[PDB]
Amino acid sequence: LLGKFAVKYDVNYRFIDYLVTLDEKMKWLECGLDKNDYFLENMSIVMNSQD
Amino acid sequence: FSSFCSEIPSVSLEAHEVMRPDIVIPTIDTIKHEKIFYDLLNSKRGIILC
Amino acid sequence: QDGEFFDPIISRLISREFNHAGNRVTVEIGDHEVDVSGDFKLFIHSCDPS
Amino acid sequence: SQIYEIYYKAIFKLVPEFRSYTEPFARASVHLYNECKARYSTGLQSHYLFSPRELTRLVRGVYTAINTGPRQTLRSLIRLWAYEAWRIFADRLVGVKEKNSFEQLLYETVDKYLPNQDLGNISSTSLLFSGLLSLDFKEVNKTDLVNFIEERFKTFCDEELEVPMVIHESMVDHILRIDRALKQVQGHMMLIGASRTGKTILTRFVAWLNGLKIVQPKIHRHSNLSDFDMILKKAISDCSLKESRTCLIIDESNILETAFLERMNTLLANADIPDLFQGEEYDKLLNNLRNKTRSLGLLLDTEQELYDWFVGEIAKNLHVVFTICDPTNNKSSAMISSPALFNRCIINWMGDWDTKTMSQVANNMVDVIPMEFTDFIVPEVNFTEPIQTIRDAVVNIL
Numbered sequence: 001l002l003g004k005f006a007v008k009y010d011v012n013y014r015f016i017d018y019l020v021t022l023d024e025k026m027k028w029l030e031c032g033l034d035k036n037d038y039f040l041e042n043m044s045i046v047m048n049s050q051d
Numbered sequence: 052f053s054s055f056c057s058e059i060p061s062v063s064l065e066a067h068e069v070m071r072p073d074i075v076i077p078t079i080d081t082i083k084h085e086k087i088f089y090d091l092l093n094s095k096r097g098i099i100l101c
Numbered sequence: 102q103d104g105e106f107f108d109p110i111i112s113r114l115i116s117r118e119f120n121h122a123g124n125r126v127t128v129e130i131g132d133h134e135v136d137v138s139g140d141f142k143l144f145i146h147s148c149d150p151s
Numbered sequence: 152s153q154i155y156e157i158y159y160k161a162i163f164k165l166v167p168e169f170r171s172y173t174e175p176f177a178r179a180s181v182h183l184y185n186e187c188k189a190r191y192s193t194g195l196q197s198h199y200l201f202s203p204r205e206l207t208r209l210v211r212g213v214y215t216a217i218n219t220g221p222r223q224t225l226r227s228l229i230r231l232w233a234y235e236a237w238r239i240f241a242d243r244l245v246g247v248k249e250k251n252s253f254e255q256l257l258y259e260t261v262d263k264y265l266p267n268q269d270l271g272n273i274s275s276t277s278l279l280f281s282g283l284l285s286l287d288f289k290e291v292n293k294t295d296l297v298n299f300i301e302e303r304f305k306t307f308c309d310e311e312l313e314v315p316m317v318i319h320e321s322m323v324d325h326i327l328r329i330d331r332a333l334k335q336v337q338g339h340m341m342l343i344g345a346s347r348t349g350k351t352i353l354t355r356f357v358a359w360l361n362g363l364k365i366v367q368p369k370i371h372r373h374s375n376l377s378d379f380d381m382i383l384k385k386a387i388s389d390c391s392l393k394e395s396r397t398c399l400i401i402d403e404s405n406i407l408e409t410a411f412l413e414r415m416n417t418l419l420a421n422a423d424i425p426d427l428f429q430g431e432e433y434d435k436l437l438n439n440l441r442n443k444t445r446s447l448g449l450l451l452d453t454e455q456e457l458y459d460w461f462v463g464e465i466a467k468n469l470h471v472v473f474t475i476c477d478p479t480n481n482k483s484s485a486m487i488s489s490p491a492l493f494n495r496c497i498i499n500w501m502g503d504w505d506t507k508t509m510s511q512v513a514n515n516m517v518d519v520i521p522m523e524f525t526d527f528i529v530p531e532v533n534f535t536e537p538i539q540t541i542r543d544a545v546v547n548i549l
């Protein structure tokens with residue numbers, strides 16, 4: 001969709017690396033969070049965004 | 052003694068009286084219905100309207 | 102702890118609705134208006150996807 | 152036709168010139184009622200139900216609109232009729248073809264009964280143009296409406312609770328519908344909007360516009376019937392004794408039990424709840440009624456007269472608005488089939504965003520301009536808007 005209409009996106013993109021701090025990643029995993037990219041993607045969505 | 056039917060009262064209510072929720076425009080069925088209610092109620096038998 | 106079951110007293114709290122004052126911030130819950138802190142956070146949590 | 156011929160004969164005292172036309176409006180009204188009841192059936196939608204109430208609403212709506220309205224010609228009356236016809240009957244209709252089916256029926260009805268060629272386009276737009284901002288409920292200019300609404304919506308967004316909001320034509324049509332509805336003597340509305348559609352907040356907007364007291368029932372899993380009674384109880388007292396003119400907003404979140412269903416099956420349908428004020432509580436109310444009545448300059452002999460005044464007060468000054476999302480589930484469908492609901496509720500069908508208004512929302516949110524560079528490609532390939540900017544591209548992608 002970003003291609004069909006003309007808008008550039010980073011061809012190499014990963015949600016985690018983009019929106020999470022090392023410290024954040026480190027801090028979450030400290031609290032007992034699971035190893036997964038998934039559970040990191042999730043923990044980001046919960047924490048990183050509350051409106 | 053005679054048998055006659057469907058004689059109804061004429062109603063004329065003012066415009067501002069048209070918005071009263073408790074109102075009825077008498078029709079043949081109104082009277083017929085009101086009357087069988089009464090008859091049933093004078094027999095002390097009960098009514099259920101569905 | 103049980104999101105499975107949820108009662109609307111929190112509804113005013115889910116949707117962000119608050120009556121603002123000079124200093125205080127109040128949110129109606131049930132029959133009483135309680136003051137919100139802002140150091141306050143909420144997490145609803147459930148177990149079964151059913 | 153006989154019943155409502157009497158009704159029109161009563162409301163047309165305000166337009167004696169058109170007195171001759173009592174039957175053909177009554178006939179046209181009953182005709183429409185019949186055809187509608189025939190074309191749209193419960194097999195398509197659960198909420199297509201037509202009763203004499205629809206005929207009742209149609210006369211009532213017309214009565215107030217004539218009374219409050221400007222000097223009428225025959226065109227004036229029959230278009231007004233067609234407006235109320237639209238709102239009472241077709242506004243509940245989903246999709247398009249069915250609303251078009253109704254327009255066709257309306258044209259047919261007018262032709263069959265009242266043949267004036269002075270009419271314009273009688274389609275749902277081109278008619279309603281229902282005056283609120285203009286003080287008497289006439290037709291309006293439509294440019295003035297959108298502006299009036301928008302400035303009064305800016306005001307309302309700032310002055311009352313701040314949930315950031317957006318405007319669209321879609322909003323405007325339903326606003327006129329909600330207001331006209333809250334203007335009608337004994338009447339209530341239910342908005343079928345899906346969810347997040349902004350139907351509750353719109354109700355609140357009109358409530359704020361016409362200065363109606365808003366009441367949203369406060370309840371939960373542990374909430375009792377005694378509890379909902381007191382809300383209704385107190386709400387009715389204010390609607391009568393203090394002349395508060397309140398709008399009661401029920402959401403489908405609010406119901407943890409059906410008990411909420413029924414006590415209002417009453418309040419909507421007839422104009423009172425008999426059980427609600429009872430025991431000594433009845434005598435207390437009665438005392439107050441005598442006082443308020445006498446303060447209005449009317450000394451009412453009997454008790455039933457007081458109570459008849461009281462009930463009439465609940466009728467004209469208490470409005471209820473339901474907002475429901477998915478009519479399809481059993482929880483909301485219990486609300487739905489329930490007749491006293493659907494037949495004294497004006498059913499207004501909103502739905503998921505219109506995919507056009509989706510752009511109006513999107514564009515109005517990206518109004519702030521962080522947007523950079525150039526479009527390497529003015530779009531060359533391939534509904535939001537004619538697409539020029541990166542802005543348009545983004546709302547189209549989204």
Ligand SMILES: Nc1ncnc2c1ncn2[C@@H]1O[C@H](COP(=O)(O)OP(=O)(O)NP(=O)(O)O)[C@@H](O)[C@H]1O
Nearest residue numbers: 315316317346347348349350351352353402474476
């Ligand atoms: N124009 C709008 N701009 C932005 N958000 C909107 C708009 N309209 C609706 N919303 C969203 O939907 C809500 C509007 O409130 P509300 O009217 O209660 O929605 P609703 O359609 O009534 N849902 P419901 O309680 O089932 O009736 C807010 O939480 C917003 O997130």
